[PDB]
């Protein structure tokens, strides 16, 4: 069936429609309505419903005025997606992605679902941008709107990352984060895809605490499961697995720890580093790298948990004294011994204080 | 001798100079030139007639700086010029059509000072010159300004092979941006890949691609060359 | 002014505004002495028939020949994004980390 395979790959590659069964079955998809009501519905009608919702969201926030200028404009009723060159489909996917990053906080609200339902029912973001749309509804993977997404979602235009949702598309029930986290352990393609999203919304200052807590949760239980996989006890295998783990996780934490203007994902990366020094027996030079970057990515708002991470990292480090920059910024900590006593009521602080005072002997 | 073959059989020879006593390590054809590099001299033939043109002699300071261990190389848009890497840290810029040393560039980090391997970039006017103490330095060579600096080699095991990818993708933790480097070492059989975009992170290593050079074993592992097959994954 | 605000109201409502929808969518160290003395005629060779500007241009210096051949090396391969600090980032870009 060689020609059947090549034509099948053309058909699953095909982003357009050429019979009337597929205009009706393609225009039938909707978040709000039913299929029978959504088939016989022009685009001025859907623009009225939605753009009522986008008037509401433009009252509720303020960064939606350029998307009034482009995406929810009065002229965007007549923009067919499939008659657009790839520079135009690329730029339109840029504005679609930036709008969806912007919306993703308020997504339990019906004005947000109305605006997203205009993006689906005209621009077919469920057919052209499924990674970003699954990435934005995927924090809210327990609300029923995620299951309406899982009923309008095309089964074979979904990234291999997100293909764990196939029995949840098949039987219309929302998936648990046991399943999300389990395939986040086995596939590093998935765990990077979440962290490629969350860091992309924070360079433009569009974060929200469900995104921060959701991402930090998946990195927490996921890196736990990864360390439990990567243990073997064979020396060269656990060395090679420690290097592979640092190469997977490494750059995500390396921006997240320094991202001072988002103290949330700064604290979540503190959290994953604390898990990583705690359960994962990483080498002393790696732990000095975590301590020095923790020391550099430092805020008044993230003082108090960052000190706890210094106690964890210094406590599981095998060498005795600290290194330089750590001692300098801990000098710049205002209430040192009192804060370390409050930490020592619940943790162990003594190797951190020993590395400090020994480094002060060596200054 | 320098024989010249086609279809499996010999179609030419090439006239070596009389004053030559050294084994000859770098054959390099570009422009209208065939250029070979022996050990401390470079003999250059005109390729349109197979006829010997000149012999380029590098400078000498301490009888080791004249040695030519990085080889020689060509840039794409640089006209009649050849870039040599010495046993000092120097890489010299030679107009091979007229013989002159036109420019010389000095290593960064003067503790690391023997050019072990050098390669052009897919960008214009940039090189990956590769020192025995460990650094890969990748440079403008008409601004003479460093673009990146990396610490790829061990002092016990420097980079001896370095090869960029000209596919156009491969980097950015999903794979959509170019800037994928490959390096290897004569001491190990493990090749190391570098994402090259922000500061050039490492991204992985093929461990025992070929066998390692094993002390007290009879097998003969190690590596000799890396090449990205150009324009391809 | 030739186009009043009322006239642009009617042009937006009646006719269509894909033009404005599109417009809103779209928002040295050394010097060689040889390249004064390396003149090349471009329409000799077939592979150099296609980096001249107009049809009637041959006499091209080594400088101008270098510029055209740079523009074609960019034409076959545009300039990469990487070619245009932190302790853990330096730890990742350092190969002393990854040992055996």
């Amino acid at each position: 069936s060689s020609l059947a395979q090549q034509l099948a790959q053309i058909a699953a590659n095909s982003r357009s429609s050429f019979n009337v069964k597929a205009l009706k079955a393609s225009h039938s998809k909707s978040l709000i309505w039913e299929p029978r009501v959504a088939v016989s519905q022009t685009f001025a009608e859907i623009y009225s419903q939605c753009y009522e919702g986008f008037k509401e969201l433009c009252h509720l926030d303020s960064r939606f005025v350029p998307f009034d200028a482009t995406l929810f404009s009065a002229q965007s009723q007549e923009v067919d997606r499939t008659q657009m060159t790839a520079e135009e489909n690329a730029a339109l996917d840029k504005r679609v992605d930036s709008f969806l990053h912007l919306v993703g906080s308020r997504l339990r609200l019906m004005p947000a679902i109305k605006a997203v339902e205009w993006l689906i029912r005209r621009f077919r973001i469920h057919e052209f941008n499924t990674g970003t749309l699954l990435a934005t509804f995927l924090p809210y993977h327990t609300i029923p709107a995620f299951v309406t997404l899982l009923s309008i979602l095309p089964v074979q235009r979904i990234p291999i990352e997100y293909r764990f949702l196939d029995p949840y598309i098949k039987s219309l029930t929302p998936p648990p984060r046991a399943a999300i986290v389990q395939q986040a352990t086995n596939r590093p393609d998935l765990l990077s895809a979440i962290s490629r999203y969350t860091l992309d919304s924070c360079r433009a200052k569009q974060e929200y605490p469900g995104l921060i807590s959701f991402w930090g949760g998946i990195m927490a239980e996921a890196v736990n499961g990864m360390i439990d996989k990567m243990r073997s006890g064979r020396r060269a295998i656990q060395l090679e697995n420690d290097h592979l783990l640092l190469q997977q996780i490494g750059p995500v934490l390396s921006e997240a720890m320094v991202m001072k203007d988002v103290p949330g994902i700064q604290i979540a990366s503190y959290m994953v580093v604390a898990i990583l020094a705690a359960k994962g027996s990483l080498n002393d030079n790696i732990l000095t790298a975590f301590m020095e970057q923790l020391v550099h990515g430092w805020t008044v708002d993230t003082l108090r948990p960052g000190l706890v991470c210094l106690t964890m990292l210094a406590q599981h480090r095998s060498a005795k004294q600290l290194s330089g920059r750590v001692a300098k910024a801990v000098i710049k900590v205002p209430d040192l011994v009192s804060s370390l006593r409050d930490i020592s009521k619940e943790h162990q602080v003594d190797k951190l204080a020993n590395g400090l005072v020994l480094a002060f002997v060596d200054r | 001798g320098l024989w010249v073959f086609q279809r499996g059989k010999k179609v030419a020879e090439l006239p070596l100079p009389s004053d030559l006593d050294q084994p000859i390590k770098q054959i390099l054809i570009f422009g209208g030139w065939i250029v070979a590099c022996a050990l401390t001299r470079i003999e250059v033939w005109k390729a349109a007639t197979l006829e010997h043109y000149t012999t380029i002699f590098p400078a000498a300071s301490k009888k080791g700086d004249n040695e030519l261990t990085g080889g020689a190389i060509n840039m794409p848009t640089f006209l009649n010029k050849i870039f040599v890497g010495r046993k000092d840290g120097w890489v010299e810029i030679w107009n091979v059509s007229t013989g002159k040393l036109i420019y010389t560039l000095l290593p960064p980090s003067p503790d690391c000072g023997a050019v072990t391997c050098l390669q052009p970039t897919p960008a214009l006017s940039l090189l990956a010159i590769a020192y025995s103490g460990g650094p890969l330095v990748i440079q403008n060579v008409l601004t003479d300004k460093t673009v990146l600096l990396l610490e790829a080699g061990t002092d016990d095991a420097p980079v001896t092979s370095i090869s960029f990818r000209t596919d156009g993708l491969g980097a950015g933790q999903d794979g959509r941006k170019d800037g994928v480097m490959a390096t290897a070492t004569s001491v190990s059989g493990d090749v190391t890949f570098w994402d090259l975009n922000k500061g050039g992170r490492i991204m992985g290593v093929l461990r025992s691609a070929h066998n390692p050079p094993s002390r007290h074993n009879i097998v003969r592992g190690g590596i000799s060359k890396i090449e990205f097959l150009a324009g391809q994954p | 002014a030739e186009k009043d605000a009322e006239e642009e109201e009617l042009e937006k409502f009646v006719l269509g505004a894909k033009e404005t929808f599109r417009e809103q969518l779209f928002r040295p160290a050394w010097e060689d002495s040889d390249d004064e003395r390396l003149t090349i005629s471009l329409a000799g060779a077939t592979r150099l028939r296609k980096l001249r500007i107009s049809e009637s241009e041959d006499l091209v210096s080594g400088i101008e020949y270098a510029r055209r051949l740079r523009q074609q090396y960019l034409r076959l391969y545009p300039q990469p994004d990487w070619a245009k600090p932190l302790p853990l980032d330096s730890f990742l870009r350092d190969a002393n980390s990854f040992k055996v």
């Binding site: - | 006209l79 000209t166 150009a230 | 592979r47």
Partner: peptide, 22 residues
């Protein structure tokens, strides 16, 4: 199954030849 490798065919490439540098 999703993500299995395709068969290797040689990818074409308009590469740059260097005999015009002289």
């Amino acid at each position: 199954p999703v993500g299995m490798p395709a068969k290797w065919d040689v990818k074409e490439a308009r590469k740059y030849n260097i005999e015009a540098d002289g």
